[PDB]
Amino acid sequence: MFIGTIILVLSFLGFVFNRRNIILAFICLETMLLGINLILLRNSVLFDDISGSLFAIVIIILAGVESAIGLSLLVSYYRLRGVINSYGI
Amino acid sequence: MLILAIISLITFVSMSKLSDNRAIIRLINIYLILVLVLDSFLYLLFLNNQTYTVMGELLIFNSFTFYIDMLIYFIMIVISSLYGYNLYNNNLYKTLFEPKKELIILFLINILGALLIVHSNDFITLFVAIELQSYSIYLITAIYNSSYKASKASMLYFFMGGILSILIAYSINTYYSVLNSYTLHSLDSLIINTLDLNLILIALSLGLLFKIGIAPLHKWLISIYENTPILITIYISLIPKISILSYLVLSNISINSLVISILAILTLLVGSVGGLLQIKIKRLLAFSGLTNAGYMMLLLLLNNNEFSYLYYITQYSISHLAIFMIIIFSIYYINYINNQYNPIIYVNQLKGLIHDNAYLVLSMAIVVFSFIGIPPLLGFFGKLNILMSILNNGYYFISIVLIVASLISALYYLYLLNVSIQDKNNILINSNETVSSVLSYILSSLIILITFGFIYNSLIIDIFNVYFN
Amino acid sequence: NTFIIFIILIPIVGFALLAVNILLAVYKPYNEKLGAFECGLTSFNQTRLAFNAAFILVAILFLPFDLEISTLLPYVMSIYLVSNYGFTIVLLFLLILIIGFVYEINTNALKINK
Amino acid sequence: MIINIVEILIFLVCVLFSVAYLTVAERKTLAYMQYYGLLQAFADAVKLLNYIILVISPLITLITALIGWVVIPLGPGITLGELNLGILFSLAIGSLGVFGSLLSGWSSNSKYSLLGSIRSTAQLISYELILTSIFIIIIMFVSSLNITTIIETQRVVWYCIPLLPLLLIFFIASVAETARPPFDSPFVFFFLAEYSNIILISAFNGYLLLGGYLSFNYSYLFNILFNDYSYVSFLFEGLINSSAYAIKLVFLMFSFIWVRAAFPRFTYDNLINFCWIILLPLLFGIFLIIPSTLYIFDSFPTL
Amino acid sequence: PREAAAHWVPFEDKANMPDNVPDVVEVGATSAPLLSASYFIGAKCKPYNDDFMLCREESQGSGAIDCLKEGRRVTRCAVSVIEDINKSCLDEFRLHWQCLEQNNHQLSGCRKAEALLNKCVFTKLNLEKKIPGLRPDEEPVFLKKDPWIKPAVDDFKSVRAYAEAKKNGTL
Amino acid sequence: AIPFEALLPYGIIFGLLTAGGGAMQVLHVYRNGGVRDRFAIDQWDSQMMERDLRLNGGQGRKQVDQATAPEAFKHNHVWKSERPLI
Amino acid sequence: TAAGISLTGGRNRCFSEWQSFMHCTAKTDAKSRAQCLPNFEDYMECLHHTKEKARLREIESVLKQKKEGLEAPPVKVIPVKAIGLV
Amino acid sequence: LVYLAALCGICGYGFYRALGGIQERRELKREKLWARIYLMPLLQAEEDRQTVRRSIAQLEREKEIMKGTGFDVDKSVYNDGKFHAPALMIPP
Amino acid sequence: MMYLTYYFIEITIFLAILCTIFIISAKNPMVSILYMIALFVIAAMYLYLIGLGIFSLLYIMIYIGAIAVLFLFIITLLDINSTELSVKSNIRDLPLVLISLIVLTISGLMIYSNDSILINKLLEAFGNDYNTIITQDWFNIENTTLLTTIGNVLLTNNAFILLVLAIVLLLGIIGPISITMKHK
Amino acid sequence: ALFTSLVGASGLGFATKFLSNKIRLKPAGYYPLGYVFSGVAWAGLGLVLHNVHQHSLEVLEKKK
Amino acid sequence: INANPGFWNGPFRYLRWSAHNRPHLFFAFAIGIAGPVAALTLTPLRRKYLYPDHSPLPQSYPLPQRAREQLTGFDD
Ligand SMILES: CCCCC/C=C/C/C=C\CCCCCCCC(=O)O[C@H](COC(=O)CCCCCCCCCCCCCCC)COP(=O)([O-])OCC[N+](C)(C)C
Numbered sequence A: 001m002f003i004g005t006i007i008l009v010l011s012f013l014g015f016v017f018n019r020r021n022i023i024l025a026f027i028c029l030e031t032m033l034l035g036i037n038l039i040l041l042r043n044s045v046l047f048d049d050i051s052g053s054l055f056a057i058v059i060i061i062l063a064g065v066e067s068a069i070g071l072s073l074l075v076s077y078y079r080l081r082g083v084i085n086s087y088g089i
Numbered sequence B: 001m002l003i004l005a006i007i008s009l010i011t012f013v014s015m016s017k018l019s020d021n022r023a024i025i026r027l028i029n030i031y032l033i034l035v036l037v038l039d040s041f042l043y044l045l046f047l048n049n050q051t052y053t054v055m056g057e058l059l060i061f062n063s064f065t066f067y068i069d070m071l072i073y074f075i076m077i078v079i080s081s082l083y084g085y086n087l088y089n090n091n092l093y094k095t096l097f098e099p100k101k102e103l104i105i106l107f108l109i110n111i112l113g114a115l116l117i118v119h120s121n122d123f124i125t126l127f128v129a130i131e132l133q134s135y136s137i138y139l140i141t142a143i144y145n146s147s148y149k150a151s152k153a154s155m156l157y158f159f160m161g162g163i164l165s166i167l168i169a170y171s172i173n174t175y176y177s178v179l180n181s182y183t184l185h186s187l188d189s190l191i192i193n194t195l196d197l198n199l200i201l202i203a204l205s206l207g208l209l210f211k212i213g214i215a216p217l218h219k220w221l222i223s224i225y226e227n228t229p230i231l232i233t234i235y236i237s238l239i240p241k242i243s244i245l246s247y248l249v250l251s252n253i254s255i256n257s258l259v260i261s262i263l264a265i266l267t268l269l270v271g272s273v274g275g276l277l278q279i280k281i282k283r284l285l286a287f288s289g290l291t292n293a294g295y296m297m298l299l300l301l302l303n304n305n306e307f308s309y310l311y312y313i314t315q316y317s318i319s320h321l322a323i324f325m326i327i328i329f330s331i332y333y334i335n336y337i338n339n340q341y342n343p344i345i346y347v348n349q350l351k352g353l354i355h356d357n358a359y360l361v362l363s364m365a366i367v368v369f370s371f372i373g374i375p376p377l378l379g380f381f382g383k384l385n386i387l388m389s390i391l392n393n394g395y396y397f398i399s400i401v402l403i404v405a406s407l408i409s410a411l412y413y414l415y416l417l418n419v420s421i422q423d424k425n426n427i428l429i430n431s432n433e434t435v436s437s438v439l440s441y442i443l444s445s446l447i448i449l450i451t452f453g454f455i456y457n458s459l460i461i462d463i464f465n466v467y468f469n
Numbered sequence C: 001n002t003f004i005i006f007i008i009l010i011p012i013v014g015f016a017l018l019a020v021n022i023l024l025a026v027y028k029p030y031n032e033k034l035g036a037f038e039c040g041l042t043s044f045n046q047t048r049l050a051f052n053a054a055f056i057l058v059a060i061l062f063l064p065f066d067l068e069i070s071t072l073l074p075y076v077m078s079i080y081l082v083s084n085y086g087f088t089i090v091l092l093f094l095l096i097l098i099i100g101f102v103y104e105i106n107t108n109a110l111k112i113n114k
Numbered sequence D: 001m002i003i004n005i006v007e008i009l010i011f012l013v014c015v016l017f018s019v020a021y022l023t024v025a026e027r028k029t030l031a032y033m034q035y036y037g038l039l040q041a042f043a044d045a046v047k048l049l050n051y052i053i054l055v056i057s058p059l060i061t062l063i064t065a066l067i068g069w070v071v072i073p074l075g076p077g078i079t080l081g082e083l084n085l086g087i088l089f090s091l092a093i094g095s096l097g098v099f100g101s102l103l104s105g106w107s108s109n110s111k112y113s114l115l116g117s118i119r120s121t122a123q124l125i126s127y128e129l130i131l132t133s134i135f136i137i138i139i140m141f142v143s144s145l146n147i148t149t150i151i152e153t154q155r156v157v158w159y160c161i162p163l164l165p166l167l168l169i170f171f172i173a174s175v176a177e178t179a180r181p182p183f184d185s186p187f188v189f190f191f192l193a194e195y196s197n198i199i200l201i202s203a204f205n206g207y208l209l210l211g212g213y214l215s216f217n218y219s220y221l222f223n224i225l226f227n228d229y230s231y232v233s234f235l236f237e238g239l240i241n242s243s244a245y246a247i248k249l250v251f252l253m254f255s256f257i258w259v260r261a262a263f264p265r266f267t268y269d270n271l272i273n274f275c276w277i278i279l280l281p282l283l284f285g286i287f288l289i290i291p292s293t294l295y296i297f298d299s300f301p302t303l
Numbered sequence E: 001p002r003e004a005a006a007h008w009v010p011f012e013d014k015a016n017m018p019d020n021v022p023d024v025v026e027v028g029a030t031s032a033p034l035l036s037a038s039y040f041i042g043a044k045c046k047p048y049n050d051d052f053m054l055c056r057e058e059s060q061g062s063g064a065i066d067c068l069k070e071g072r073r074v075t076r077c078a079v080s081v082i083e084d085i086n087k088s089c090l091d092e093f094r095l096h097w098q099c100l101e102q103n104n105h106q107l108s109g110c111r112k113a114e115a116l117l118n119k120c121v122f123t124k125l126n127l128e129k130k131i132p133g134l135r136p137d138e139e140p141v142f143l144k145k146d147p148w149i150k151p152a153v154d155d156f157k158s159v160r161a162y163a164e165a166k167k168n169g170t171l
Numbered sequence F: 001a002i003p004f005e006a007l008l009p010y011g012i013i014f015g016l017l018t019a020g021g022g023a024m025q026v027l028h029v030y031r032n033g034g035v036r037d038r039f040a041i042d043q044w045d046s047q048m049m050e051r052d053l054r055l056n057g058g059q060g061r062k063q064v065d066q067a068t069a070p071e072a073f074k075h076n077h078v079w080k081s082e083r084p085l086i
Numbered sequence G: 001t002a003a004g005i006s007l008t009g010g011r012n013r014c015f016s017e018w019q020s021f022m023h024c025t026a027k028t029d030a031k032s033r034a035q036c037l038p039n040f041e042d043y044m045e046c047l048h049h050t051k052e053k054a055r056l057r058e059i060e061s062v063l064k065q066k067k068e069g070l071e072a073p074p075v076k077v078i079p080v081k082a083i084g085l086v
Numbered sequence H: 001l002v003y004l005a006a007l008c009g010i011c012g013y014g015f016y017r018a019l020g021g022i023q024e025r026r027e028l029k030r031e032k033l034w035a036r037i038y039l040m041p042l043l044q045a046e047e048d049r050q051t052v053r054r055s056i057a058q059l060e061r062e063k064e065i066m067k068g069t070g071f072d073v074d075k076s077v078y079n080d081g082k083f084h085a086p087a088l089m090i091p092p
Numbered sequence I: 001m002m003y004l005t006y007y008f009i010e011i012t013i014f015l016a017i018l019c020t021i022f023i024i025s026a027k028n029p030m031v032s033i034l035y036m037i038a039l040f041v042i043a044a045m046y047l048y049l050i051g052l053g054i055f056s057l058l059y060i061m062i063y064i065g066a067i068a069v070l071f072l073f074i075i076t077l078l079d080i081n082s083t084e085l086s087v088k089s090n091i092r093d094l095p096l097v098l099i100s101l102i103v104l105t106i107s108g109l110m111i112y113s114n115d116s117i118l119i120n121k122l123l124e125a126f127g128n129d130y131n132t133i134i135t136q137d138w139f140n141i142e143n144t145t146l147l148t149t150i151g152n153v154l155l156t157n158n159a160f161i162l163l164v165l166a167i168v169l170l171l172g173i174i175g176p177i178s179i180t181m182k183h184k
Numbered sequence J: 001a002l003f004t005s006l007v008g009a010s011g012l013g014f015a016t017k018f019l020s021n022k023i024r025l026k027p028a029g030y031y032p033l034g035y036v037f038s039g040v041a042w043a044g045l046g047l048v049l050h051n052v053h054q055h056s057l058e059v060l061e062k063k064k
Numbered sequence K: 001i002n003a004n005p006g007f008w009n010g011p012f013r014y015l016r017w018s019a020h021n022r023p024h025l026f027f028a029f030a031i032g033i034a035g036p037v038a039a040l041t042l043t044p045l046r047r048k049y050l051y052p053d054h055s056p057l058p059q060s061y062p063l064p065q066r067a068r069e070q071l072t073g074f075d076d
């Protein structure tokens, strides 16, 4: 597989360099998962086997759960809730 | 027994007040105690090393998995006792050790992920268990998010573990592309000899071992251990390591690996030398765990290593729990508290502890000597089994590195005792409050295990010989 | 083959990124008037705004619940083939998910400003 | 080639005219109870051409809203694209339709518009959960993602009759999906895209619950009128199917503008709480009961 | 096996069949006639078909080249039964396949033509239509009365033929 | 009273949709050669239409019930040459 | 496990080779496992077709270095619209 | 209670029609499935005969191109003697 | 016609390269989100080209209408009340990248003579100048699609995996609630 | 011997109780009923382990 | 005015309280728990009285379990 592997390479090296760009690092995590899924789906199609596609959907669900957890982490980190709690208990 | 506990906890904690957290954790403590003492008879399924496959070849079950499983319940019982039971009945200790509403549920889900890692028979199950454990441990690390010191550690651990899990998935999918399979049952001697799938397994072992933090990827987990709350650090630094190392031992995919051997030597050297450069307790214990991880990784280079690994992991788990609980008990004997999450930071704050609780210092001396390997404590016997195993396979340079690493690590282990046996003229601001009887009993039981577990060495050897052969 | 592509592509784009990132070494040193923020003065008089935790929880929990729903699609495409065994498995799956739904309902985590 | 071009041109013209005329319909309906913008904006948008993706966002959102129509049938096999995954394609387009409000909120570079976009986006995803839930509930009776297949299974009985509360839930969730009261240059693009999404949701409800193009059986009528297959008979049957489907669509449309010109507007917090406290528990109950009902009577649908 | 991909082209082979294997006439009926006559073909040639499969699994991979002869037998039996139909029940067969083509190849919308063809074949071809695996408690789907599902439009000339037959009394 | 002006554009949309659907039905019939369309076709259906196209000489969906096929069908079998998926 | 299942619920492309290889492994032991090398080689060939690719490369190299004509029925390519025509 | 009782009747009558429709569709699917079952032996044999003709044709084509070269064409890449349909055709 | 359809896959690959570079080479987080949305669209088209249109639909559904929507939602929360994110210097981590990448280049370099028998593997890997032959058979009678097979395997063969992913979704429900709201 | 194993386990329990008392900065004879409880519990664990050992030896001998 | 009487204090009193004071949750639980319970307690009754389950549908060709018999007819 070409496209998946090259997306994975580019996103991995984008992660390694920035490493302090949490928005972009988490984007790179998402794109690396996408690149792995592409390779897995291509090999599943080539082999005509269902295990590749099953692992692909499992990776999709795990990626969604991971994205939800990570975005909750970013909410807590950047204090997205806001405060305006001045003059209050 | 664990799924039902998780479901019941979600249901019960949903409809409970915040003040019921201690009671719920106690209830689960006795629940797990009864699970161990009442369902322990299941070890009869594994006479003569009988092995079973469960859930359509997705899980494996033998005496090794059963023993790691029971050890994980024992560790979980001890750690959950550290949360349910109050060390001191005063508002300060109320504030420092206060469990979150979801902490016990996350703990049980992480235990479930670790057990599924240990029992995995397929790469799909392996990856799913890894992701379960990883997401749970991220949530455990982040559930105390009132500090930037903990927040940076949570974010770093999330991102580094995400990269590591992506690498693991990439290796698994490369294996699938090569063989059109997701299980190790398709790997035989002919399969290894004919085709070069060694690099795939090396990459998989790399990704798995970096999750527990071997060199040269140790600094991030050491920072995380330093910055997380100590009641969280005691858990996040033991259970994932146990799960990953048990899966690696049972997988048996790194026979006489040059890369694994070099990385183990590097891990030992880094852990031993970097420990000398530490003035913080948490970083010192992190490098101690790194050195122990290197010791156990030395066992990945040879076969028939089940007994040595099991003995070493059990004794190290007991010693790790004991040393963190000693550090927790010593909090009462210092004049100031660093943070709400990490009340003690520097080894210098333990100075003169022998004038406040001499028997606490005695227990710490026992556990530190077991870490060094002074007979007849369990640590010496675990290190001796490691030495016997490595000399049986002819790794002489590895043995020399092991001995040198132990000798170097003894220096920064005795650093703790030397600091603690000093003289502190500053008298305490606190006096006569009684420490918890349950937690003190558990700590004393751990110390007595470390001190007198060598009585049952022959009994354990015979049980292993009959149940693993 | 994927490993090969990975290994040889690492040095090339690695050096490219290395060069393009040694470029910013010095650049726009953000000498902007950062004086009122290093003191603690405010110039908005307005734009306070707020976000109840329930709002962001609705936004975030749209994702796991949508995954839960979309996981039902494979079942409805093979409902007849796996009739009773699959029916029981889906019942257990749904009950486990409803445990979490009960958690989010009892906690009242999703109730916007009252 | 020519036939396909003529068909797609006719369908696009009809859809665009319907969307444009529904604005006038809504205005007149409001008046009694109590267009031409694309050409000027397209040249302005072309003049504008990171600015690139931000500039291209509105028209591509409108294109997505229009492509949502490619799978809507007007009869057995009568569609631009006969997709075996028409339900999944419809769900994907409906999911993509939430980007319009967000990018429109960004377009103005205004904080108040951004709050509007955030509230709208949260409400849209909240009721997208309901819409997808009802979609899957319906699919549980068909075991197929082909829209024409579901419409054909609805010959025995419209799925509305066994699931009338589901019809009410879908209608409420549809009024709340598009921020329609009481459930409330790029502007013209987003406006027509929004109304296209409204008509798409009406069509979704129509072929999920109201039977689609079906009407009273006309086998006897065709037997009396005609003695053999002819283009006149095909034209008449197509006219009947399309008239029935369009009358159902118009009824749903009139219901939407009626609730706009009806029961008083509700607050946003109540709008989301109604979905997350009242609708979703019912939908999970239906998730549990429908397969249970099919298992009790041994009626699991086949492929 | 999976279907083709984004780019695929069909390549035509004009090489002659090897002379060692005998040449046999092959079925020329399209989809609708085959759907109409599948039950009769199966009823007449089930033993040859069973022999064909049994050889296919016994050859263990070489079914294409080792099971030629009974495959020739099966195609000969199919040609024989189709010739019997094409010289025997022309009208009913034409009704049935035309209706099936006009009714999206679904057997539900052509019960009248199905019945006509069934009576023709059972009357003077000595072949009977049945669905295996049915217990005597339940009655066959093709003999049902008052169906749950009705065709969109009943075929005009098919209904006329049914009415003419029921005036005759053949049914 | 019923507002006819309010319902006028609704009727316009109704009529436009009806006429468009009728035209689409007529066009589909003309393209199919006077027969109804095929919907929800699986792999078996696609293979059947491919075989029918091979049999009838490419005359659309024309059906022939002749027992003996012409000699052209003995050599018109075509395989699909898939581009390698990189 | 989901091994041995294709994308349509049937038997995958390399079902026969894998079945033969696992039967050979079951009928043999660890010491005699070396006898089952051809089965694993055939399974890997079904997975990747390396030997087939090498043979095709040799054939193409031989073909591209020849100038004389070929007297043998070649393969004709036709458009999808021209399937079964003439 | 009249509306609730009527709603049960409306839903009950709809379910009875809906439930029955599924069951008959299963029977119709059963009839459709058995129709394709009988057609497989005649359709599969026709493809099998064509497969042999194309396989031998490629072997005859390949051996004539390589005439005068020391290579083995009839030797299959696989180790077993079973018939194997040739794949990976050379682009035209 | 044929010229474009033969290189649709390569066009998607090149567009993916451009989108990923634009992702890792921007300043505004919005630009990266929009370009990863474009990358997801390109991945969907690429999956359609292979013959996985259902997976492309699943991608467009989940990764865009949920994941990307939540990404853009969270970023929009960061902008209405302007809170610029502090930009720390990566020059701290540049030296380690230098050392590691020089080590990797040297590891690829001392191969030298052995590259003559290893680079050729990638040389024929790049070529791939053979077309797959697609043959037809009639062994399938049921109208079974990819999603049906997914459901069958996930509900019967790997139902345990389905239950463990149920626990994973349970975790994804509990965790955000645990770390987002202040109880009592 | 079983009696010796029970005595050793009970002594280990007594040592654990004594160590717990001394850690809490309490006299050695603080809660003697706790000494009894700890000794009984540890003796029971020792009895279970001794039974496991006896069964292990029985299994080892039986395959001869 | 209204206070929860507690489920454990009285089951039927709490059932009435939920039906009258919390309609949405009570009905959600009612339809949710009816499904599996009614299935378990009614499916055997339906099988015994209403109608037996249908015969399994074919998934592939039914292969006879026998040896190849010698047949005559339609030879070359
Ligand atoms: C009333 C039921 C309560 C049982 C709950 C047990 C929880 C175990 C948890 C944490 C580990 C603590 C030490 C366990 C001892 C090993 C047992 C065994 O023999 O180890 C063998 C395998 O040896 C090995 O490879 C190496 C083991 C390394 C042990 C290192 C610690 C040494 C000091 C401990 C001496 C014990 C002091 C007791 C004082 C009365 C497993 O034996 P097995 O799989 O055949 O089953 C055992 C039968 N069982 C389940 C009833 C118990």
Ligand SMILES: CCCCCCCCCCCC(=O)OC[C@H](COP(=O)(O)OCC[N+](C)(C)C)OC(=O)CCCCCCCCCCC
Pocket (backbone or CB within 6 Å): D289, D290, D293, D296, D297, E138, H012, H015, H016, H019, H020, H023, K038, K042, K050, K051
């Ligand atoms: C929890 C649900 C309990 C409901 C119990 C009702 C049973 C009443 C007895 C009438 C059955 C009958 O006599 O009609 C029989 C019908 C149809 O079968 P048939 O083809 O005509 O029979 C011939 C048998 N063959 C084909 C094998 C020859 O069967 C049914 O499925 C209808 C059941 C009524 C609707 C129940 C829907 C449940 C409500 C769902 C709300 C979410």
